[PDB]
Every structure is written in structure tokens, then in C-alpha cells.
Coordinates of C-alpha atoms (C1' of nucleotides) and ligand atoms in Angstrom, one line a residue:
Chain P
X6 CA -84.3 48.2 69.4
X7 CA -86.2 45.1 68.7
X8 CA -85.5 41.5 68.9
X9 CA -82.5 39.5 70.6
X10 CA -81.4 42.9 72.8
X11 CA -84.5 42.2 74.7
X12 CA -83.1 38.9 76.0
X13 CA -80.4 40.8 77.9
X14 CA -83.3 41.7 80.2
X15 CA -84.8 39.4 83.1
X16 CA -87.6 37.4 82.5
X17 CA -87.4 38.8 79.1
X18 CA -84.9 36.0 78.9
X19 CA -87.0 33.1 78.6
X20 CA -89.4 34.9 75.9
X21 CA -90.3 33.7 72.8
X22 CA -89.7 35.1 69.3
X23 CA -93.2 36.0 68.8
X24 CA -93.7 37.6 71.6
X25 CA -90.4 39.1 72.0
X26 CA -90.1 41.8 69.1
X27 CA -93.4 43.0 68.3
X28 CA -94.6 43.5 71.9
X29 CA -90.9 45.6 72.2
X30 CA -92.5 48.7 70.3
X31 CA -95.0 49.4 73.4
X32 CA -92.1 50.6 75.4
X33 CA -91.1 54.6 75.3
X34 CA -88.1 55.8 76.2
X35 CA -87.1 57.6 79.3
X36 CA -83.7 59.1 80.5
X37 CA -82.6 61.0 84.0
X38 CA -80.5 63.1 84.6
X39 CA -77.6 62.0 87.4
X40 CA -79.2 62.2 91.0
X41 CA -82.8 61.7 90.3
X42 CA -85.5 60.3 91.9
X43 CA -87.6 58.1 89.4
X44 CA -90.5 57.6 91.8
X45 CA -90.7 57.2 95.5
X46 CA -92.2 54.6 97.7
X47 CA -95.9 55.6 98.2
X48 CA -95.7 56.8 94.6
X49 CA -98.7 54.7 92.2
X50 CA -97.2 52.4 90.4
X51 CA -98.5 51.8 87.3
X52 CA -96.0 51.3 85.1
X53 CA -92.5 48.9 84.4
X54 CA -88.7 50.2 83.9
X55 CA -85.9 48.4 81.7
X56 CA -82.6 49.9 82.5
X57 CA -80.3 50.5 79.1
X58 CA -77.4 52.8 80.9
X59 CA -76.5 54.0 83.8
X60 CA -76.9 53.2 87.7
X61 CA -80.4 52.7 89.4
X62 CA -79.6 52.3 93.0
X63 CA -83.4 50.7 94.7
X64 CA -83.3 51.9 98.4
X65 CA -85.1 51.9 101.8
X66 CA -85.4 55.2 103.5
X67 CA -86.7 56.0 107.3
X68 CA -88.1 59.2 108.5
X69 CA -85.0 58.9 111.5
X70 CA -82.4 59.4 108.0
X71 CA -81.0 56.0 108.4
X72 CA -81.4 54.4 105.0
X73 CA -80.8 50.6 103.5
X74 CA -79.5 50.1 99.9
X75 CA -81.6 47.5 98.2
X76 CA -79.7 46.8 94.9
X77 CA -77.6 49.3 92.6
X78 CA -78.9 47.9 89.1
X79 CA -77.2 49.0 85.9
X80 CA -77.2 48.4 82.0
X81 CA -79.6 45.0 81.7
X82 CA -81.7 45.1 84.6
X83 CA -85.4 45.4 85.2
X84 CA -87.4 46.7 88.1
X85 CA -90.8 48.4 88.8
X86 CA -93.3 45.0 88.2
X87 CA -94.0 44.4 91.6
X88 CA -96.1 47.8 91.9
X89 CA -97.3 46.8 88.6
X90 CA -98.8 43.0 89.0
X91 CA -100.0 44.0 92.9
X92 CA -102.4 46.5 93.1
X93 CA -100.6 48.3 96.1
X94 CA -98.3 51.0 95.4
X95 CA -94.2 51.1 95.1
X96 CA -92.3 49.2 97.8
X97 CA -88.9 50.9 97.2
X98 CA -87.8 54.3 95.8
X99 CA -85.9 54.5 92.7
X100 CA -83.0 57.0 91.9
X101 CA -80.4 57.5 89.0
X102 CA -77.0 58.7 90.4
X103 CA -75.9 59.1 87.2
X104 CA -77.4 60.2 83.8
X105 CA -80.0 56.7 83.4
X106 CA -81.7 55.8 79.9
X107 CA -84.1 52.8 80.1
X108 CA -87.3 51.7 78.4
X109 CA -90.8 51.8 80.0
X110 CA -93.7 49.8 79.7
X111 CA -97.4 50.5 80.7
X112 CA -99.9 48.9 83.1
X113 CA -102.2 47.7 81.3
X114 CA -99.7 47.1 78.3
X115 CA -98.3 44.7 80.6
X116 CA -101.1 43.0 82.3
X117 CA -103.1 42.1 78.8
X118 CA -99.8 41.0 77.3
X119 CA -99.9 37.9 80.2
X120 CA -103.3 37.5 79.3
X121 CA -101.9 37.0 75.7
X122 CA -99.1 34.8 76.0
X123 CA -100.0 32.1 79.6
X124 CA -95.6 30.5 79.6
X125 CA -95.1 34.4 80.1
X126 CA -96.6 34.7 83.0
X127 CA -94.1 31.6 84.3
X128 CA -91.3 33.9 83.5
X129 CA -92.7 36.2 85.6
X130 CA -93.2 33.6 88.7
X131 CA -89.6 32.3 88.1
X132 CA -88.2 36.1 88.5
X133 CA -90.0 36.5 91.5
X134 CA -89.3 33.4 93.2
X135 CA -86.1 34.5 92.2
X136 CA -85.7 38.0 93.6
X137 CA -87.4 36.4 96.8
X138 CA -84.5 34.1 97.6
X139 CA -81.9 36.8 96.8
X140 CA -84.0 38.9 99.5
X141 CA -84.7 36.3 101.9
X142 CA -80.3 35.2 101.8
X143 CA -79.6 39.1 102.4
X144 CA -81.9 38.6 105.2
X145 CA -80.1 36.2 106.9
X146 CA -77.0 37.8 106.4
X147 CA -77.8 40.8 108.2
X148 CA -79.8 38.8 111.1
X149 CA -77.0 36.2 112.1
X150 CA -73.8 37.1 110.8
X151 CA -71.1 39.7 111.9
X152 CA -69.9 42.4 109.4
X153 CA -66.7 40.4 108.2
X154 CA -69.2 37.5 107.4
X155 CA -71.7 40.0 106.0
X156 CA -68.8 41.7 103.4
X157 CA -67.8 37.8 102.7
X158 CA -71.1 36.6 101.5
X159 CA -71.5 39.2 99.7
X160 CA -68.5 39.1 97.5
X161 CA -69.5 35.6 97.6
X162 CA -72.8 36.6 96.2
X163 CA -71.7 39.0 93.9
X164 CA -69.4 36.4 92.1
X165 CA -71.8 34.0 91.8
X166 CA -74.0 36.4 90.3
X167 CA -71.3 36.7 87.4
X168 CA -70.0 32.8 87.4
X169 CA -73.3 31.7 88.5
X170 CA -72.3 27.9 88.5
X171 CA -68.5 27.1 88.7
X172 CA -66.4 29.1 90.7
X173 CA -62.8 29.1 90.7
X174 CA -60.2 29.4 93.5
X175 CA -58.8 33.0 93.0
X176 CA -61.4 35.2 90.9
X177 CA -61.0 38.9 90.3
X178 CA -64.0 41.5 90.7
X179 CA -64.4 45.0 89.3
X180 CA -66.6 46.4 91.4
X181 CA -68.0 49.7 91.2
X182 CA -69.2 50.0 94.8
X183 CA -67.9 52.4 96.8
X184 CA -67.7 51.7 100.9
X185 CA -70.7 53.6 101.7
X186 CA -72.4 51.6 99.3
X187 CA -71.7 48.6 100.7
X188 CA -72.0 49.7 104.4
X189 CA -75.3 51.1 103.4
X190 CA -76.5 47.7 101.1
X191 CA -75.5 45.7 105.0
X192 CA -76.7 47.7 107.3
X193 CA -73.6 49.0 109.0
X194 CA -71.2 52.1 109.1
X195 CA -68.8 53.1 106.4
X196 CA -66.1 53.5 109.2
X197 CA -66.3 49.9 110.3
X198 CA -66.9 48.3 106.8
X199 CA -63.6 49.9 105.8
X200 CA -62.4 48.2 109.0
X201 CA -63.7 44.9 107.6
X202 CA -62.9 44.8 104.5
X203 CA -59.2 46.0 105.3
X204 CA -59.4 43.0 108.0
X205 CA -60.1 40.6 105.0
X206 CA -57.2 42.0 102.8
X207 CA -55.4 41.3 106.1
X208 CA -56.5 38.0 106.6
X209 CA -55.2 36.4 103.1
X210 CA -58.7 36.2 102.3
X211 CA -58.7 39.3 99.2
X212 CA -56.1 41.3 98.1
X213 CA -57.2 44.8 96.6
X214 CA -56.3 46.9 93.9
X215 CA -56.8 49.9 91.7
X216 CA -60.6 49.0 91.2
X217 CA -59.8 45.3 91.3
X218 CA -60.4 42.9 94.3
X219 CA -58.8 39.4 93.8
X220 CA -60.7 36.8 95.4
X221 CA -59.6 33.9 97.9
X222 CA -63.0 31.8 97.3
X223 CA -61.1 29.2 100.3
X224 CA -60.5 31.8 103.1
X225 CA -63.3 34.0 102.2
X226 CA -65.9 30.5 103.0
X227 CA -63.8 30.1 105.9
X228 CA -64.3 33.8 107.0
X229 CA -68.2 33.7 105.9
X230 CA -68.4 30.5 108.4
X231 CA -66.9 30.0 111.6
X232 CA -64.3 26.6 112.7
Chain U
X6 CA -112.5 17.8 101.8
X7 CA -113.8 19.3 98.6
X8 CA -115.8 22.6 99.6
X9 CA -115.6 26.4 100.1
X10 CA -112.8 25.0 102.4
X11 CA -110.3 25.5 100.2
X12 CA -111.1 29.1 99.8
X13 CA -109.2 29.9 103.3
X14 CA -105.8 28.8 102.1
X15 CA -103.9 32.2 100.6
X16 CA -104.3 31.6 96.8
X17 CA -106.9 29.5 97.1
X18 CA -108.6 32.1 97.9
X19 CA -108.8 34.0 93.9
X20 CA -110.1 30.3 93.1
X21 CA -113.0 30.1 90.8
X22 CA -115.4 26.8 91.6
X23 CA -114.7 25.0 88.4
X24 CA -110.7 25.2 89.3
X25 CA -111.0 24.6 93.0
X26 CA -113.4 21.5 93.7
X27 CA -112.0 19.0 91.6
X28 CA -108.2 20.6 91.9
X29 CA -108.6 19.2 95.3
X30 CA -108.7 15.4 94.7
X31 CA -105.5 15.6 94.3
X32 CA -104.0 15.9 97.4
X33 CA -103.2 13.9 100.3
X34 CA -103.5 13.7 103.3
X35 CA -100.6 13.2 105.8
X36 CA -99.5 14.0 109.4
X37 CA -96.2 15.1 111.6
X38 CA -95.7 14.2 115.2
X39 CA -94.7 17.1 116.9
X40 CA -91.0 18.5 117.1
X41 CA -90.2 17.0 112.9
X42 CA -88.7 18.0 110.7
X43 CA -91.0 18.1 106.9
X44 CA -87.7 18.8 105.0
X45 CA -84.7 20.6 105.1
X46 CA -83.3 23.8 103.3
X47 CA -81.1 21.3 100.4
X48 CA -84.1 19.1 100.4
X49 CA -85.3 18.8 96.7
X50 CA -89.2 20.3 96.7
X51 CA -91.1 18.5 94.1
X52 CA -94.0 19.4 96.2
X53 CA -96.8 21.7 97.8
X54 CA -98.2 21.8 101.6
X55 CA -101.7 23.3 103.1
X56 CA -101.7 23.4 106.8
X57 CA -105.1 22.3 108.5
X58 CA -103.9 21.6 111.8
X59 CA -100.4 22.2 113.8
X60 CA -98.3 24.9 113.9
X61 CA -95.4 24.6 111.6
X62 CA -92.2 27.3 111.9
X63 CA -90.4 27.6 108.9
X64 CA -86.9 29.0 109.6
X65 CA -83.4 29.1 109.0
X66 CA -80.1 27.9 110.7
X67 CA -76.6 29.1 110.3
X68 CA -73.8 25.9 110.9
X69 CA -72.7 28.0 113.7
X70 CA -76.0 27.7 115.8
X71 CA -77.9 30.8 115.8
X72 CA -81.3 30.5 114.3
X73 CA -83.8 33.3 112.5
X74 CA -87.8 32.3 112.9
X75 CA -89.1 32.4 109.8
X76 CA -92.7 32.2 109.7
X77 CA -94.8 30.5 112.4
X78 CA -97.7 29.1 110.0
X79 CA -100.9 27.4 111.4
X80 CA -104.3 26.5 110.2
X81 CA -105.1 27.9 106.8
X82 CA -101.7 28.6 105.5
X83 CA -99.8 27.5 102.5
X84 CA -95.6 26.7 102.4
X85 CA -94.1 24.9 99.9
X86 CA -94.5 26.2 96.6
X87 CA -91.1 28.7 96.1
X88 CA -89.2 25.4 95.2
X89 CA -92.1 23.7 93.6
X90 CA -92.6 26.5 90.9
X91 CA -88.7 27.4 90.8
X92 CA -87.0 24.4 89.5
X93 CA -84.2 25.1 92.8
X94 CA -84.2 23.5 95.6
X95 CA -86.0 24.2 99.1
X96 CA -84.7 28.1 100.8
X97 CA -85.8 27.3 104.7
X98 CA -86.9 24.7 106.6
X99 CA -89.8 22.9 107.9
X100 CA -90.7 21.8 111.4
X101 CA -93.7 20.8 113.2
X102 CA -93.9 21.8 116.9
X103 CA -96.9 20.0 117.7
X104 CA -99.2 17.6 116.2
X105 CA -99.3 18.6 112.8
X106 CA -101.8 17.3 109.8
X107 CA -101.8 18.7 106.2
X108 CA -102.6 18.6 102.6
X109 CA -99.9 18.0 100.1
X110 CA -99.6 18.1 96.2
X111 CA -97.6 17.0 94.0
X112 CA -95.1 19.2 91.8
X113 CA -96.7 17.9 87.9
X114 CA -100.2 18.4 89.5
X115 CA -99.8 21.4 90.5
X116 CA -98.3 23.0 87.4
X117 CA -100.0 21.6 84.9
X118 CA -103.0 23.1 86.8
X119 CA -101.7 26.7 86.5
X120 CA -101.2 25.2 82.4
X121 CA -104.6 24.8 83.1
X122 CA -106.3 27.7 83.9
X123 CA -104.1 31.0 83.3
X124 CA -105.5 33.4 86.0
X125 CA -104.6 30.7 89.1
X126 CA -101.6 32.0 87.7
X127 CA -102.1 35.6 88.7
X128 CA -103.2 34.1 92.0
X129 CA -99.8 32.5 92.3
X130 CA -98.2 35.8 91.5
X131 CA -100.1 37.9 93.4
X132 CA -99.2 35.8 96.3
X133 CA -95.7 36.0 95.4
X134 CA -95.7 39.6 95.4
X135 CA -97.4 39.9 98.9
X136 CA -94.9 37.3 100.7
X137 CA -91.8 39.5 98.9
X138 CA -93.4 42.3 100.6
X139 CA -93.8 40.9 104.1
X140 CA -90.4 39.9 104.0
X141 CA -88.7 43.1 102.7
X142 CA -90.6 44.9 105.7
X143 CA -88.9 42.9 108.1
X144 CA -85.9 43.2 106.2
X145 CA -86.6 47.0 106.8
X146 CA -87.4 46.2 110.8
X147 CA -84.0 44.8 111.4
X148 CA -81.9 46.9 109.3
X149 CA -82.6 50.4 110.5
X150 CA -84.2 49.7 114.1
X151 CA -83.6 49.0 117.6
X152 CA -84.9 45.8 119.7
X153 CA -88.0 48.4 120.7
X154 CA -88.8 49.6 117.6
X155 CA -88.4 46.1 116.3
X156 CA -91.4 44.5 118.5
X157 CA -93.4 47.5 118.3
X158 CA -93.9 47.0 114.3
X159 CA -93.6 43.5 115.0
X160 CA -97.2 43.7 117.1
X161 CA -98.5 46.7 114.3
X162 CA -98.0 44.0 111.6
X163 CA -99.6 40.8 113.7
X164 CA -102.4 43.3 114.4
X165 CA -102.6 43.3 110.7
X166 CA -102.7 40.0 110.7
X167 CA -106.1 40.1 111.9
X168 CA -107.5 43.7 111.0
X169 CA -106.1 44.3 107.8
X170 CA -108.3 46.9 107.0
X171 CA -109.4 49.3 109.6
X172 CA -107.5 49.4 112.7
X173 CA -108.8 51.0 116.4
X174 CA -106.7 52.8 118.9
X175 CA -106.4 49.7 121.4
X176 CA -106.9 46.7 120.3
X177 CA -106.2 43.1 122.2
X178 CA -104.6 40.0 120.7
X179 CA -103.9 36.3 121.7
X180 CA -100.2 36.1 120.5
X181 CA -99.2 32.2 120.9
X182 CA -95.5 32.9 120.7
X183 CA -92.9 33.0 123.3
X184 CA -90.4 35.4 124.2
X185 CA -87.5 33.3 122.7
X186 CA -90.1 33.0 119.6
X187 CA -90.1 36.9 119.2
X188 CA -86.1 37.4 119.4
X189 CA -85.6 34.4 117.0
X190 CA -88.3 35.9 114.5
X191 CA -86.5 39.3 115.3
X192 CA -82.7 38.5 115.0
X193 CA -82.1 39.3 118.7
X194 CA -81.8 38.0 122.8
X195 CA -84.6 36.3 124.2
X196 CA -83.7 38.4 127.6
X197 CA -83.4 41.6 126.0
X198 CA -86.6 40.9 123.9
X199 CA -88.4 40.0 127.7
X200 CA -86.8 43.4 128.3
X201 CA -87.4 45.4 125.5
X202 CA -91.7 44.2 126.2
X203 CA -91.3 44.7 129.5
X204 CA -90.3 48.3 128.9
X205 CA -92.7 48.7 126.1
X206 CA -95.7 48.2 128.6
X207 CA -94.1 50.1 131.3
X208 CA -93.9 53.0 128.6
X209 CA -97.4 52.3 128.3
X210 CA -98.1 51.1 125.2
X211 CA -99.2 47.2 125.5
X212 CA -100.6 46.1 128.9
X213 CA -100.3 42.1 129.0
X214 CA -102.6 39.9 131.1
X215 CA -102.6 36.1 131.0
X216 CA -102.3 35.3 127.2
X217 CA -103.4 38.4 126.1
X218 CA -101.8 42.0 125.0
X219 CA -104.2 45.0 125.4
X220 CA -101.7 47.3 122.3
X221 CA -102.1 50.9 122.4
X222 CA -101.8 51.7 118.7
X223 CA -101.1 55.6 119.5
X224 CA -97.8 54.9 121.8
X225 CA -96.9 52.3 119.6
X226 CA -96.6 54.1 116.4
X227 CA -94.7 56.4 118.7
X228 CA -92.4 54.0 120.0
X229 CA -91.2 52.7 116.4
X230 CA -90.7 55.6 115.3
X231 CA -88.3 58.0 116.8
Chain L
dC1 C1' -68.7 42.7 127.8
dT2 C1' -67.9 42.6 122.8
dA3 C1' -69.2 44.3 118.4
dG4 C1' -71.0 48.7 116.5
dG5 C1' -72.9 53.6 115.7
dT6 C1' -72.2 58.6 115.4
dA7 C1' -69.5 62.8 115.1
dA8 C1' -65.0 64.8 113.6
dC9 C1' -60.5 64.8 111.0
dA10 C1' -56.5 63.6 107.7
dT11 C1' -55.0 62.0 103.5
dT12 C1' -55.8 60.3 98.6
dA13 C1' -58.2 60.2 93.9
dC14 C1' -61.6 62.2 90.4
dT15 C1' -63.6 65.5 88.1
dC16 C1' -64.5 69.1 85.7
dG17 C1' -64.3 73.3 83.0
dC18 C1' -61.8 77.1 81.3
dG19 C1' -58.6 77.5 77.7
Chain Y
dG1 C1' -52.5 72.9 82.5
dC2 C1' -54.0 74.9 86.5
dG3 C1' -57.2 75.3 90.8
dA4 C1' -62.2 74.1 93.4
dG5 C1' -65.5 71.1 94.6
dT6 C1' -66.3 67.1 95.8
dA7 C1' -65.8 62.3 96.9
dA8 C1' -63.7 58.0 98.5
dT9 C1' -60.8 56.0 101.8
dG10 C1' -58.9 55.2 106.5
dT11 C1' -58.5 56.6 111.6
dT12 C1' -59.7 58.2 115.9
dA13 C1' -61.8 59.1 120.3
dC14 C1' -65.9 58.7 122.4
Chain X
dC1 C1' -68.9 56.1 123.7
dT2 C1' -73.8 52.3 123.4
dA3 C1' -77.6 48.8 122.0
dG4 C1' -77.4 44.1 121.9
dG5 C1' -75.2 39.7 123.2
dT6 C1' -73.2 35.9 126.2
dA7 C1' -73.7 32.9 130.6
dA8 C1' -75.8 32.0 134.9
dC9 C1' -79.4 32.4 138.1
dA10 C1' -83.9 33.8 140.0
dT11 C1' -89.1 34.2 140.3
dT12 C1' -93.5 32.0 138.3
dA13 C1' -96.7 28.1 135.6
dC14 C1' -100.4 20.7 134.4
Chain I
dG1 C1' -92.0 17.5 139.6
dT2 C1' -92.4 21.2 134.0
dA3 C1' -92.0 25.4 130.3
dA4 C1' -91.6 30.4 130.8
dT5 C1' -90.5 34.9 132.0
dG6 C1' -87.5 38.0 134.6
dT7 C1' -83.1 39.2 136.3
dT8 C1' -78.3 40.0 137.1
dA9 C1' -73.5 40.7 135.8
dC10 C1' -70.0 41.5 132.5
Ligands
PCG301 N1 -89.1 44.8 98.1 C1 -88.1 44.8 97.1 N2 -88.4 45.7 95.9 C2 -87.4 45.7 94.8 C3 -86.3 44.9 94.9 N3 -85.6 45.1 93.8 C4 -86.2 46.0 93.0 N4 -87.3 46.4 93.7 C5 -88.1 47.2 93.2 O1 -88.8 48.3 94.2 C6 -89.9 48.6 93.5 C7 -91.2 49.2 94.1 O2 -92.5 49.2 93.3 P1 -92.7 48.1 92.0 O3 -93.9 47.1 92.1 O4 -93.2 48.9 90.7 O5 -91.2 47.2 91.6 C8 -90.4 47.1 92.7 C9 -89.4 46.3 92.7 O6 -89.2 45.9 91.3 C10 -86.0 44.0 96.1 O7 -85.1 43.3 96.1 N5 -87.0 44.0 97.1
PCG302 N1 -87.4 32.7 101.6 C1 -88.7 32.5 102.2 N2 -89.3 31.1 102.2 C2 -90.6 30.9 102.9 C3 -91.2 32.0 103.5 N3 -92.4 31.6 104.0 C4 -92.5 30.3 103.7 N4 -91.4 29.9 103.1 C5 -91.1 28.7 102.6 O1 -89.7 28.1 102.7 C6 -89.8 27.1 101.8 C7 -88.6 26.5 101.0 O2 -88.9 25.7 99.7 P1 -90.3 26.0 98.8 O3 -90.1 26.4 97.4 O4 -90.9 24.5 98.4 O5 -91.5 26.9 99.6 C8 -90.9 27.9 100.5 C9 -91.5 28.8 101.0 O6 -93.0 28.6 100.7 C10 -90.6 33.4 103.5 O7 -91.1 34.3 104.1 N5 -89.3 33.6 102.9

DNA sequence: CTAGGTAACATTACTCGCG
DNA sequence: GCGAGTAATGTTAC
DNA sequence: CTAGGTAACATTAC
DNA sequence: GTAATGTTAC
């Protein structure tokens, strides 16, 4: 593992030959086993995960038991920086529910390589403006939408994160979310996103099959707004 | 303009001298009557605002009509940079309530600055990190809280706002935001927001006298929680 | 006063191992 | 070439 | 079943 | 005469 697989990665992306395949052999390897927390929230954070296989599901948890999904990253992702960069300690926990493999890269490591290589640190700021907006959306949904809107921008979302510039009329999904995922990524109950998302199949907005959910881009921007 | 002044403004403040005397030629001055609009959410943002006077909300607004406060900057705060640094377009809006005068800099400026020096970079970053942060906690607020619980961390984190460090067991602060302010900022009913503070001093955890909220740090970390 | 939350229950689909 | 734990999906009455 | 939401009105504040 | 809280009902 060393040289264009590390593109595959975020802000990896916009790296540069030189900097892209040697600084790849500081990262060890690091696999858990299905149900497992990587770290928690107050937990020092001092080091940086890449994700190779399995699911990483990033979550909010209160004392009460109520909890908020933040993201469900799989193969190609990368998390843990934040920690990292700012002094303070984790702002999420971190859990494989299912067997995870993924790369990890040190502190330090980390730091002196943006001290070596100044466009990097760019990459960086471009992530996390990035991340930012995706936050800042999912905020608004959740503060001024109902739950149908709230399930419609996210499909919404969710395509665009595959075609992230086209977008077609009728697009297919596989999603790989159950309904308590999604209930628990917007904030609401399992019972009543059911409800929702059975309202939207119902409402010629997306018709659902065996793992498949085929997407009315017209009706579901019609459901996500009002008229 | 060309002083220690600039230290105040957030990442400013990691500035070394040599970077943040001269940097500071290059911005201009310019002024908002109150109740405009700086920009809009679609707005391209080629460019980079310091606040010195004013209070300017940043916010945004659904087509349907319901609105979610933002931020409520003032003196000594810095907007304007997500779109700058990220070649996308603005993500909230801009509007001055009152008189409002500020700095601004240009997008090429400002990045071939950071070119410039590579630490302001960390600055930037570190930044970055901390507004992520303040915005996932409130994230947090709404998601898994009621309208009580919501005002009470609302208060604990605007008491950070000023102690960031220490923290007493009461402490008074002079909030300069209205009730329909708070359930804009908060996702929620300016009455039930009167309601829910109305019920939080009558719990007694904040005692409010003309501008002022006497909090009582103990009942309030037991109102939001359980 | 409507949109939701929480506690129960009834199907319906996977998923192992043993084999 | 089976059953035993789950786990997901809907539904209901508060 | 219940916070939280809508409209409409009431008691204070150069 | 204002902007602002508090209230009520539903
Ligand atoms: N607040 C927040 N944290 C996230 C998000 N996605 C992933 N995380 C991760 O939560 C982790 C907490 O500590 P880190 O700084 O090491 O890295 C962080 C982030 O990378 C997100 O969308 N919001
Ligand atoms: N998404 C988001 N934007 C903010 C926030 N606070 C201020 N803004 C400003 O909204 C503005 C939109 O476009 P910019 O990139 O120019 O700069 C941005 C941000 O600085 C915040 O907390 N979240």
C-alpha cells in the first residue's frame, strides 16, 4: 500500500506525488473486531484513522441514552484529525459495527508533515470547510424541517454525494442503512421514520425495493420544500 | 488601524508582528445601515469581513419562512472566510441590525498571505476546528434536548463566552438578545422560549433583573441534564 | 392542536454453525 | 439442511 | 399519550 | 405614541 490508493482518501486527494507515497509508510495498521469502540469522546486524541473495510459509524451519545448518529463512514473515508490539529480532545466517539481494517497515522507524524509540505495544509482547510457545510446543512434540516423533508434531503444529500454535479430524474440508491440508522442520523424515532419513508413511497416520490430505492429527484424537491 | 488591534479578531489573534502590521494595509474600510443585508447564502464570496462596530446575525432561511439564528457577531469577530478559502459559494447569510462598520479583504490577498507565512495557516485551521466544534454542540443541543435543556446549555456556553476558563457557581451576564433571538438561535417558539426562561428562574436557576441574568451554574447543570 | 416520542407486539429477512 | 438468535420492518395504542 | 407549534391577545418599556 | 415580554387557547 503505497502510491495512487492513497488518493481514494480525503484530502489525500489533492496530494502530490512526492508527498503522497513515501509519507504512506508512517501509517500502521489497525483492525476491529465488529461492535467496537475505537475511542470515545473525552478520549486524547493524538492520532489519525484511514478507513480500508468495513463500517465506522461517528456518533453523539447523552448520559439520558438518547443518541445522534453523526456519519456511518466505510471503505475510503478518513476521520480522527480534528482531535489531532486542535489540542482538545475527541468530539465524537468512534465504533466498528462490523470487523473494520484502516490505517493510522501519528500526531506528531502528522503535524511535522504540514510543516513539510505548506499546499498540504490547504488540503486540510478545504476538508474542513467542507465537513463544516455538510454539518451546518444537517443542521438545518433538523431545526426547520419536518421528518418527510428531513428523509428527502437526505436522500437528496446522499445522491449528491455519489453524482456530486449532475443529477438525473430517476436515480437508484443502494443504501445500506437500516431505519434506525436513519431515525437515529435525524433525530427522530424508528417508528415514525418508517411512517415517512412509507409516506414517500406513497406519495410517487420513491419506490423501494430489495435493497434498492429508485429515486423521483422531481417529487422528492417538491416533498423537501413546501408549494 | 495597524496595532495590537488586530490581535482581538479570532485568528488574528496566533498573528506574529511581522505577519500582522503590514497584512493590515490591506483592508478597507466600509459601513451597513442598519437592517442590510452584506450578502446572501448563493452570493459568490471572494472576500473576508472583521467586525469593529454593529451587530451582524449571520443566519439561515428556509423558502418556506421559518428562520434558524446563526451567529449574532459583534465587535471583534471575524465571518466571511468559509467561502473565501473554499472555492464554493457563501453557506448563510449576512445582515446588519444596526449601524454596522467593518474591515474587509480581498480573496487573492488573503490567500497569498497564508502562501506567505505557513503557520497563519494553522491559525486558520485551528479556527476552523473550533467553529466546527461550536456548531456540532448545538447540533447536539437540538437533537437530543428539550426547549429547557436547550436554554440552559445555551446560557452555560454564553457564560463561556466570557469565562472560558474557570467558571463560579453564580455568575451574572448582560445578554443583548431577545426572546424571539433565543428560539430563532434555538430552532423553537419565541412564547414557549419566554416560557421555558420563565420556568427556568422560577425553578431557580437564573434570576433576571433589568438587562441582566444572575445564572446559577449548580441548578443549571441540573436542569440540562436529566 | 398537530407532529412526535416511548413502550409493546406482529410479521419478515439474515445469519450462522453444525454437519 | 435444519433450528436459534437476532435483526429489520411495520403497526398500534397511548 | 406529550413537548413544541400556530394565532391572537394581554401586560410592560424613548 | 414604540419594541418586548407574557399569556391564553387550541
Ligand atoms: N463534530 C464532528 N466530528 C466528526 C464528524 N465526522 C467525523 N468526526 C469525527 O469525530 C472525531 C472526534 O475527535 P478527532 O479530532 O480526532 O476527529 C473527529 C472527527 O474527524 C462530524 O461531522 N462532526
Ligand atoms: N455554516 C456556518 N457558517 C458561518 C458560521 N458562522 C459564520 N458563518 C459564516 O457564513 C458565511 C458564509 O460564506 P463564507 O465562506 O464567506 O464565511 C461563512 C462563515 O464565516 C457557522 O457557525 N456555521
Amino acid at each position: 500500500r503505497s502510491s495512487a490508493f492513497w488518493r481514494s482518501f480525503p484530502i489525500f486527494e489533492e496530494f502530490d506525488s512526492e508527498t503522497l507515497c513515501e509519507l504512506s509508510g508512517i501509517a500502521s495498521y489497525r483492525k476491529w473486531s465488529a461492535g467496537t469502540v475505537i475511542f470515545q469522546r473525552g478520549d486524547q486524541g493524538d492520532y489519525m484513522i484511514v478507513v480500508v473495510s468495513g463500517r465506522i459509524k461517528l456518533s453523539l451519545f447523552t448520559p439520558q441514552g438518547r443518541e445522534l448518529m453523526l456519519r456511518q463512514h466505510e471503505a475510503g473515508a478518513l476521520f480522527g484529525e480534528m482531535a489531532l490539529l486542535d489540542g482538545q480532545p475527541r468530539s465524537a466517539d468512534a465504533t466498528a459495527v462490523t470487523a473494520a481494517e484502516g490505517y493510522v497515522i501519528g500526531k506528531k507524524d502528522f503535524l511535522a508533515l504540514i510543516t513539510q509540505r505548506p499546499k498540504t495544509a490547504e488540503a486540510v482547510i478545504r476538508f474542513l470547510c467542507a465537513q463544516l457545510r455538510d454539518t451546518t446543512d444537517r443542521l438545518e434540516t433538523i431545526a426547520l424541517y419536518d421528518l418527510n423533508a428531513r428523509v428527502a434531503r437526505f436522500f437528496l444529500a446522499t445522491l449528491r454525494q455519489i453524482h456530486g454535479s449532475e443529477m438525473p430524474q430517476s436515480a437508484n440508491l443502494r443504501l445500506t442503512l437500516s431505519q434506525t440508522d436513519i431515525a437515529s442520523i435525524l433525530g427522530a424515532s424508528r417508528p415514525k421514520v418508517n411512517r415517512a419513508i412509507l409516506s414517500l413511497e406513497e406519495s410517487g416520490a420513491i419506490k423501494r425495493a430489495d435493497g434498492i430505492i429508485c429515486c423521483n429527484v422531481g417529487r422528492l424537491l417538491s416533498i423537501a420544500d413546501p408549494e
